[PDB]
From a paper:
Like other members of Reovirales, MCRV packages its dsRNA segments and a number of RNA-dependent RNA polymerase (RdRp) inside a double-layered icosahedral capsid. Using cryo-EM, we determined the structure of mud crab reovirus (MCRV), a 12-segmented dsRNA virus that is a putative member of Reovirales in the non-turreted Sedoreoviridae family, to near-atomic resolutions with icosahedral symmetry (3.1 Å) and without imposing icosahedral symmetry (3.4 Å). These structures revealed the organization of the major capsid proteins in two layers: an outer T = 13 layer consisting of VP12 trimers and unique VP11 clamps, and an inner T = 1 layer consisting of VP3 dimers.
Subsequent 3D reconstruction with D5 symmetry imposed resulted in a 3.4 Å resolution map. All copies of the structural proteins in the D5 reconstruction were almost identical to those in the corresponding icosahedral map, with the exception of the well resolved ten RdRps near the ten 5-fold vertices. A hallmark of the MCRV non-icosahedral (C1 and D5) reconstruction is the ten well-resolved RdRp densities located slightly offset (~30 Å) from ten of the twelve icosahedral vertices that are organized with D5 symmetry. The structure of the RdRp revealed a compact, cage-like structure ~75 Å in diameter with an extended protrusion near its innermost surface. The MCRV RdRp can be divided into three domains: an N-terminal domain (residues 1–617), a central polymerase domain (residues 618–1090), and a C-terminal bracelet domain (residues 1091–1422). In addition to the distinctive arrangement, the RdRp of MCRV has two conspicuous structural features: a specific protrusion on the innermost surface of the RdRp, and a long loop that blocks the gap between the thumb and finger subdomains. While the RdRp is located next to the 5-fold vertices, it is offset such that only three of the five VP3AB dimers contact the RdRp. The extended N-terminus of the VP3A2 interacts with the RdRp, with residues 40–48 forming an anti-parallel β-sheet with the residues 1220–1226 and 1390–1395 of the RdRp. Together, these two unique conformations of N-termini in VP3A essentially bracket opposite sides of the RdRp and likely help anchor the polymerase to the capsid.
Author numbering:
A (entry chain C): 61 to 854
B (entry chain D): 303 to 352
C (entry chain D): 454 to 503
D (entry chain Z): 301 to 1425
Amino acid sequence: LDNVIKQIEALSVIVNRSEKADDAQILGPNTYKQLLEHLFSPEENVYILLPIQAYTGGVIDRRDASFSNFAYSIASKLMMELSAATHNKIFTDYTRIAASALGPEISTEGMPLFSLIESLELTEAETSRLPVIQDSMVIQKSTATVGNAQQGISTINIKRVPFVGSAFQQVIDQLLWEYSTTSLTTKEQRRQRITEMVNDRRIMIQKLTLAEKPQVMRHVTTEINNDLFFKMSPVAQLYIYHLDRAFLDGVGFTPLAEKQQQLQLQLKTNILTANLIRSAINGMNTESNLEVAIKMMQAAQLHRASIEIAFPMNVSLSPEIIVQCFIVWMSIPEQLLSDRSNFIIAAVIWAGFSADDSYADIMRRSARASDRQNYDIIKAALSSRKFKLPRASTTLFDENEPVVRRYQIGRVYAPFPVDRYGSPVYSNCTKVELASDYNAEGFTIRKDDFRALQAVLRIDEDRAADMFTTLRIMISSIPAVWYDAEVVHYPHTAVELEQLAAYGLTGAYPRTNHSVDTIVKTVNNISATYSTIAQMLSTIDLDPTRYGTSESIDKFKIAWENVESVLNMEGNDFVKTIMYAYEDNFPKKDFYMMLKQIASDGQGAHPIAAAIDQLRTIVYREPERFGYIDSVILTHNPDVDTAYNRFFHLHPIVTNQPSNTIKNAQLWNEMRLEQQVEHIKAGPVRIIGPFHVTYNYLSEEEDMPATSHIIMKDNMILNDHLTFNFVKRERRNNKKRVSSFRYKAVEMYVAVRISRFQLEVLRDLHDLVRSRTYLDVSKSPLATTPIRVVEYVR
Amino acid sequence: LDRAFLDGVGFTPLAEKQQQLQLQLKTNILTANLIRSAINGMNTESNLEV
Amino acid sequence: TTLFDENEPVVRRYQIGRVYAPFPVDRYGSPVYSNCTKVELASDYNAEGF
Amino acid sequence: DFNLYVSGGASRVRNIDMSTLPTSINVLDHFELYGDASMKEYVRSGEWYGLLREIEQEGMTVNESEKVFANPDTYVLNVKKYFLRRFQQEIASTGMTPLTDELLNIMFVHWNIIVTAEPKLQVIKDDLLKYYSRYGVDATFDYNMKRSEMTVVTRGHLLAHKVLECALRIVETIYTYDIQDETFKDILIDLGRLIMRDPIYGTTTVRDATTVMKQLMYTQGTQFRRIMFKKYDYSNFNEKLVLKGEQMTNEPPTLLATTHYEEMDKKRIDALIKANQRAGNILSQSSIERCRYTDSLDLVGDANRYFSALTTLEAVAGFASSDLLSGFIDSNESIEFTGTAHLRKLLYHSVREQITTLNTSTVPRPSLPKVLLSSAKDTASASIEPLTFRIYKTTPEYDGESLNLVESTVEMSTRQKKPNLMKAAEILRSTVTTNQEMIISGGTRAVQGGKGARAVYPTKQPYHIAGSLLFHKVDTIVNANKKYRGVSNKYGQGISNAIPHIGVPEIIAVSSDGMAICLALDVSAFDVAQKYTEADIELAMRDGFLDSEISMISGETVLERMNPADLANNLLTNTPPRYKYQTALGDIIILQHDNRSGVPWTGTQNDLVNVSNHHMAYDEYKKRVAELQRQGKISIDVNDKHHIVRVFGDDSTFIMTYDEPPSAEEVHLMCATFVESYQDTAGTLGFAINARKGMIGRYGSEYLKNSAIYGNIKSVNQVKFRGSEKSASYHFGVSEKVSMIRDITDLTITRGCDETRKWKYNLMMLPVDLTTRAGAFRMHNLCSIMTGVGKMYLGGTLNNKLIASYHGSSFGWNFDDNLIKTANSIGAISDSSYDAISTKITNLADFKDSQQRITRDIITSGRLPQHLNRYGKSNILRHILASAAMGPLSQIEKNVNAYNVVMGILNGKLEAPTVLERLNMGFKYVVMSDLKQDDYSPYSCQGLQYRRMLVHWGLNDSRITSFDPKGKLQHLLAKNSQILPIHFDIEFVYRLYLQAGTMGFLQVMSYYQLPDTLTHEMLAAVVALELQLGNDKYAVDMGVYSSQAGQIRINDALMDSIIQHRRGPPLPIIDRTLNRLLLHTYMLMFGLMGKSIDSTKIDPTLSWRAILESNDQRIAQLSELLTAV
C-alpha cells in the first residue's frame, strides 16, 4: 500500500557508471586446487588409487530416464562451478624448494612424499627410492603460441612442473589450463594494433619499456569493426535521433526583439503606414527552436530523413503564410527539405510573380510523384534576367576531432548556409532584382520589401566559433555506415511552417556543452550491449534445424525470455528504453531476426561452450568420481568375481549374468509383493536407472552398518542413495581370512550388488608423478596498468 | 454453444490505445485534428456480444 | 484472412470442419492483407468539409 | 505530552458560562484514551509510574515517551484558559460597524419603523430583553481597537456575542425580504428562534434540515411557468442561449428524492426534534406540520423569492469555524482502498495520456524574471511571506487639535506582501527544490454556514516559482477562455463565474430542454481522498512530461540552471513536507500525501482526476444499462447520442442527450443505475458519492451554488458585508466604506431582495456608519453622499453616475463627489512619496536581471524626469518597490486625509463645480417608443420592471462587446502577451494615466516599443474607466461589475445600429467611447421609465470640435519629436 518514486538519472551518469569497473584486461596470479585421493597399498610393489567422489550434485531425470541429459547436467553445473574460480586468473604460483649449489630447482607440488611412509606402510627397501623420486622431479621450460590472425601472433614461455597425484587430477588440470588461456596476447602487439587503428599523428601512445614488451594481457574474442555497425541500419535512425536529443541542450538564437528592431530600421515605409510583412513576423516566438534545431541536425546527418513541412492551409492563402514561405526559401537550405516541401514553397513563391497562373490551379494540376522536375523548372525561372531570388544552399564539411574510436566517419551537410565565412551561400546569385511586384489574391508586397528582408536574414558573423565547435564534435562521433539508414518513425521528421520560419528568421544554430569523449563512450556502450546479446544467442540458441524460420508464434515467448533478461543487466539501459518506446514501428520479431543474423554472420560463442562438451566425455568415462552409477543388480545367493579379492577383503562386486531386467525404478517399487519374489526366484534381476551412489571405504577395525538398501513395509522398496561398504586389505592384515559375517549379518536375504568398478593400480613408484603447465612469471610476467595515451606529464 | 463456451474476452483498455495513438502521432492543440477528437469519445464495454 | 485447419487430435463422434480466423493475423505472426501493405497515398482525405 | 480530540459532541464552542463550574483544575483521565481501551486505568496509569521510578532509582534508560505517560500529573488543565483559547481562534468578529450601535439603533429608536409592518417580530425583542434582564452584567461587548483590529472579549458567556449576532441578522433578513405569504415568514421565525439558543452548534444542527428542505422545495406544485430557449448545442462550449417565450405546465419536475422521500423526511424530522429537545419546547407538532408547507409552492408570483430567502437565514450566524485537529483526524479515516490493480492501471494510463495531449503545443513559456513578478501579482494567501528588516515610519503625522497641534513619528514594519525581491538574488541562483521532512507554518480559513474548517497548505517560494513554469503550458490551454470544439472543451476552469447566464449557459438550457438529463453528483473530501492514489497519479504526471518534451534529463538542482524536463524529476517526486499550525493547548504537525493545497497545479490535478474516473464509471454504466435493456425495464429506443462532462476543480457535471425522451420512471431507473455504478467503479479507491447529496434528476440542473428549475435561476446570494471576516472595515476610510456600502447591497438586490426595504434599512445607518475619526473630529455622513459614487435613490440599481453628475449642478450633488475625490485622490501624494534606496544594497543583481529593449536610450524618452525617471527601464524595480507598498502607509495617508476632508468644509474649499460637465457632449434628433411590456425572464427573483427591460432587448452575450472598462482592458492586456514589457498590469496603466494625464501616458508608452493603434485603443478604454467612476482601491484592484447593466444586451452590436450613420471621417476613439457610453447610460434609464430609443444623431456641430482636437493633438505629439529636446 506504499510506493516510493525513483528519480531517473541522466544519460551521462549511466554511461560513466557503466565504464567504472568490471573489465577483463588485467589478470592475476592463481594456483591449482588439490582433490582428495586416499591411496593405499595391499602388499609389496602394488599401490591403489581409490576413486573418491569429487562433486555431489547431479539429479535424476524422472522422465524417460534419459542417459545423455544426466551427464550433460552434471558436466554443465560442475563447469559453471569451476569457471567461477578462474574468472580473471592464470595458474602461475606453485611450491618449489630451491636451486642452490645442489641439484637444480626441484618441486614439491602434490602431497608431500614424506606422508607416503605413513599412508602406505612402505618397508625399508622401498623407502630408499623416495629420495631419488624427490631429487628427480626437475622443471622443464617450453614455449607456446597464442593469438589469432585478427590480433597479433605472440609467443609466451611456459613451465612444465611434475607433481604427484591421480591421472584424473592431471586431466582436470589440463582442461582448466586449456580453458583459462584462450584469447591471450602481449602488450607489444596490442600497442601495434592500437596505433594501426588510430591513424591520427596528433595522438601518440605511451611507449613501452623494455620490461613491459613480453607482458601478457587478455583481449576480446572478436574486434568490433564497421561490419557490426553496418547491420544496425534497420534501426539506426532512432539511435541517431536520441543521441542528438541527449547532447544538444541549448540553442544560440538571437532574441526576436533585436530582429524586429533591425527590420524596422531597414523598411522605408512610414511608422504610421501599415505594412503586412512587419505585422506578420510580430506573431512569432522562439520557444520551439530546440526541437527544430534537433530535427534539422538529424536531417543534415541522414540524407533520407529530409524535413517534411506540415502546412495549415488547404486551398487558400494568408498573409503570414507568404512571408513565412519567403523566409524559408531565403534561409533554410534546400538540401535539408523533402521534394514535396521544396515544390510547395516554390509554388507559393511563383503564384504571385506569375502573370496568369494562380495557386489553386498550380496545385490541382501537378502530381506529387514528379514534383522534383517542377521544382527544378520553377527555380530556373526564378534565376533568369527578369527575376533573381537567391536560394539558400550548403556544402559538405569533413573537419574531424582527435579522439580514440574504432569506426570510420564521413561527410555531413551543414545545418546553416554558412561556408566558414560570415557571408552566406546561395545557389544562383547574391542579388534581388524583380520585374514587378508580388500579388496573389491581394496581399501586395512592395518592391523593396524583399530587399529589406534579405538584409536581416544574415548570420551574426560573430558566433562562428561556437557555430562550428558543435559541428566539430558531431561529425567525428557518428559512424559513417549509419548515414544510409532509413526512417522508421515519421514524427521525428515533421515540423510546422511557423516553427521553421521562426527558426530561420533568428538564425539559430545548435549548441552543446559536452565533450567528444562522452558521445564516443555512449556509442561504444551501444556496441557492447549489442555484442553481449549476439554472443549469448550464438552460444545458446543458434541452431539450423528444428524450429527455424517456420514455427508457431507460441514458441516466440520462450525465445524472447533470454533477450529480455539480458536487456535488464544494469548498464544496457540505453537500448532497453529505445526498445520499449518505439515498439509499434519496430516490433520484436524483426529485432530478433536481425540479432540472429548478426550472431550467425560471425561471433565467438564462448570459451565455455567447448569446455562443457570436452568435460562431458570425462563425465562419461569415470562414473565413480562423480558419485553415480547405473545398472545395479538385485539377487540372492550372489558370487564374487575373485578378481578384486586381491585388493579388498570383501566387496559388493559380483559377476552374475542378469535376467529379466526392469526398465527403471518406481516400477519395481510399486509392482507388488510376492510378485517380485518370483522375479528373484528365477535368478538375478537388474535395475537400469542411474542412481546417486556413495562409496565408503573402511579398514578392518570397525563397521558402518548403514545398509538402507531394502525396506520391508508390505513391499520391497529400493532406496534413493544405496551406500555401499568396502574393506581394505593392507600390509598390517593381509594373510588373515575375514569370516564374512558382518557383511551378511547386517544385510537381508535379498542382496544388492554392483556389476562394474574402476580403479588404477601401479607397479612402480615412478608412475605416481604427472605434469602440469604454468606461466613462468619470471620471463613473461602478468601485465598491469594497461596501455594509455600520454597526457598530464609531470 | 459459442455463448456458453466463450466465457471471457481479452482486450486492452481504451486508455492504452489513446496513449499509443498520441505517442505515434504528435499534433499540437488548436489545429482541429478530428482523428484524435473522434477516437477520444469511445467506449468498449460491449465486447462479449461482438 | 485465410482458412485454418489445425486441430488437437482427440477421440470424438461427429465430423470436424474448417473455420475462418476472426483474427487478421497469420500463423507466424505476420499480418495478412488482401491487396497491399505499407499504406501510402499521394493526396489528403478531402471529404465535403472534413 | 497530551492533547484533546473531540468530534460531534463539542466540535464548535457553545454558549457556556465561565463561572458556573469553572473547575480551576481537572483530571483528564475522567474521559477515555482514543487509541487503546486496555491502557486507560489511571491507577495502573500510576502504579506503572511508581514501579518505573523505583527501577530508575537503580538506573534505567526510562524512555521519556513511556515514562512521562505513566505520570498522572500530566493530565491537568484549566478549563477557563482552554475555552478562551478555543474561542479566540474560532470565532472572528470584524464586520463593518460595532454592534452596540446596531443594537440600540435598530431596536430602541427605529423599532417603531420595523414593528409597524411585520408584527411577528416582537418575539425577537421579547427574547433579547428578557435575556438581558434575567442575568445581566455578563452580556459584554467591550471592543479592543488596540492597533487596528477589533477583538471581542468574552466574560459572562462564551457565545453571548453570536447570540446577539443571530438576533440582529434575523430581523435584518425578515425586513429586507418582502415575503408576501403567511406561515412562511412564520416558519422563518421558528427556525430563527431555534438557532437563537445555540448560535453555532444549532447552525450545524439545522443545516441538515435546511439543505434537505432546499433539496425538494418544489415537488408538489400546480403551475410552473416553463421558460423556453432556442435549441442549444451542448457540444460547442462557446454556444450562447437566447430566450424565446413561456408556457404554463402542470408537470412537476422529475428530480430525485421521489424514490427516497421517506428517507429524507424522517432524517429532517429527526434533526428538528433533536434541535427542539434541547431547546425550549417549541411545540414540535407545529414544526412537523409546517415544514411540509415548503414543497407545496409554485413558480408563479412572488414565490420565487422564497428559495433565495431561505438560504440567507441559513447563514444567520457569521463566519464560525471548526477545530482543525478533529477534522484532520476524521477526514483521514473515512477512506477505503479495497479494489483491484486494474483500476489503478486504468487511472494511471488515463492521466498520462491526458497530460501528454495538452503539454505538446506552440504556446510560449515565460522566462524566470517574468514569472517571478507574476508570482508577486498572485499574492496567494498561502504564498505571501512578507519580510522587511526595518521600514522606519519616520513620517511626520499631524495630530489631533484637542488643545494644540502636535507632530510625531512612530515606526511600523511590513503590513503588506513583501516579495523579498531583494532575496531574489539567492532565489534566482542557488536554491534546491526538493522536500526532506522540513516544517512550514499552516493557516486556516472560515466559511459561512458553519460547515467546517478549511485548511490551506502554503508552499515555499522556490516550489511555487518552479511549479508555475512546469504547468504554464497546461494551465493556459485549460483556461483558454475562447475554445471551439477543442479537446480542451471538457475543462470549464476558464469562466467569468461573476454572472450566471454567460458563465454557465449549458446548465440553464439543460434545465429547460426535455430531451436531456443532467448528472450533478458530488464527492466527499476530494483532496484527502487522493492520499491512496497520489503515488500513481503523480507518477503519471512525471512521465507524461518526459515525453512530448524535446529536452532530456541532465540532473541539476539549481533554479535557472535546469531544463524544462529537469524540473519534473525534482518537483514531482512525492515526499510531501510537514505543516505546523497552532491549536488549543498546543501546536500540532502533520504529513498529507495527496494533491495538497498551495501546490502550483491543484486545480489541474483535481480536474484531471475528476474527468478520469467519470469515463471509467460511464463505461460500466453502459454495460448495466445494456443489461437492463435486454430484460424488460428501460426498454429499447432509449439510447443517448452525445455525452459531455464538464469539470471545474472538484465540482463536475454530466449531461446526456436523447432523441426520444424517456418517461419519468425511466429517468429514475437510469439515474439509480449510474449512481450505483459510480459508487463501486469510481468509488472503490476512496471516493464516495451519495444520491441524496446532489440535485441529480431531470428538468433541473445544479452547478456550483447556481441552480435552475424550469428555466428559472435560483441563485443563493448569502453575502454578508455587515459581518465579514478578515477585514478592518471599522478602521477603513470613507472611500472604501462608500465603495463597499453600494456594491454588496447591489448584489443582494440582484440575487433576490426588494429594492425598497433593503435600501430603507441601509439608509437607517448611513449616519451611524461612515464616522471617520480625525483626532477629536467626528463626521456623520447623510444620504447625499451616495449620489457622488453614482447611485440614485429614485432610480433603480443602475450606475447612473454620469447622468447625475451633469445634472448635479443645480440640485446640489456637486459637493459629495468633490468630497470623495478629496478623500481618495490625494493619496496620489502617497504615490508621489517614493522611497529611495539608502540603508542596504545586497547582491542587487536584480536590476541586471530585469531589462527591456529600448529605443531612446536611457537618457532620452522624456527630457525632464517629470515623466522619465518614474517609468525608467533602468528603474523598473525602483518603481515597483514603492508601487508594491502603497497600503502599508496608505492606511495612515487616509488618516491624515481625514484632517483635510474636515478642513475642506471648515474653509471655503470644495463646493466648486466639477470638470466633467465643462465638456459638452450630447445628441440631437432622438426617436423614442414604448417598451415591450411582457414579463418572461429567466431571472424571476428580480423586480417586474427589470424583467420587462430584459425581454425587450434579450440576454447579453460575449461579455466583451459591452464595454465594462473594468474588464475590457484586462482582456486586451491578456490577448496582448509576448509583446508586452516585463512589468505591466491594470494597476500600472491606471496609476500611470492618473499621474501623467493624457500627455505623459502616451509620451512614456510611445517610446516603450509598443504599436500605436492598440495602445491608443486601451488608452480610450482607460479614460472611459476613469470617467465611469472615481478611484477606490477596491474598485481599481480586481474590479466590480454593474450587474444589472451586464445582463441586458446593450453591447456595441446593436449600439452601433442605434447611432445613425455619419457622413464625415471616422471619429477618433478618445470621444467615441465617451459618447457611446453616454448613449448606453441613457438607454438604461429611459427603459426603467418605460420608453426605448431606436435612432440617434451624433449632433455633428459638436462632432467637428471633437475632430478638431486630434488635428492639433497629433500635432503636439509629433512636434515634440521634431525637436531633440
